[PDB]
Design a protein around this ligand. Sequence first.
Ligand SMILES: O=C1NCCN[C@H]1c1ccc(O)cc1
Length: 113
Amino acid sequence: KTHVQLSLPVLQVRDVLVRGFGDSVEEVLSEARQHLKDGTCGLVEVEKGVLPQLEQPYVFIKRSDAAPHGHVMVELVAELEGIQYGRSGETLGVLVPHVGEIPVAYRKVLLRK
Ligand SMILES: O=C1NCCN[C@H]1c1ccc(O)cc1
């Protein structure tokens, strides 16, 4: 399928044990997609002070359209040293590996893949 319905655990930035997916734009998009498939991907909501606490390159989920079955349609956009790879809508948050941190909420998304 071109899209998959996912329910992403929303993590507090200070709970995150692995603060990024790797070392290059291509690796972090690859790893983020693999973790989304395997159900081991969390979401951190972006506010003041969050991004400097996470590791670049960043993988964002961004709104791709204006929301089937309660799932907002999203796509992946990576960022490194102020350059974004991808063009999309409003940021829903930054993806990180999930290694068993307790979430504060779940975010339902329809991931374009
Ligand atoms: O996340 C998923 N859940 C169910 C099966 N498919 C996936 C998936 C496949 C490929 C991707 O690139 C990203 C996600």
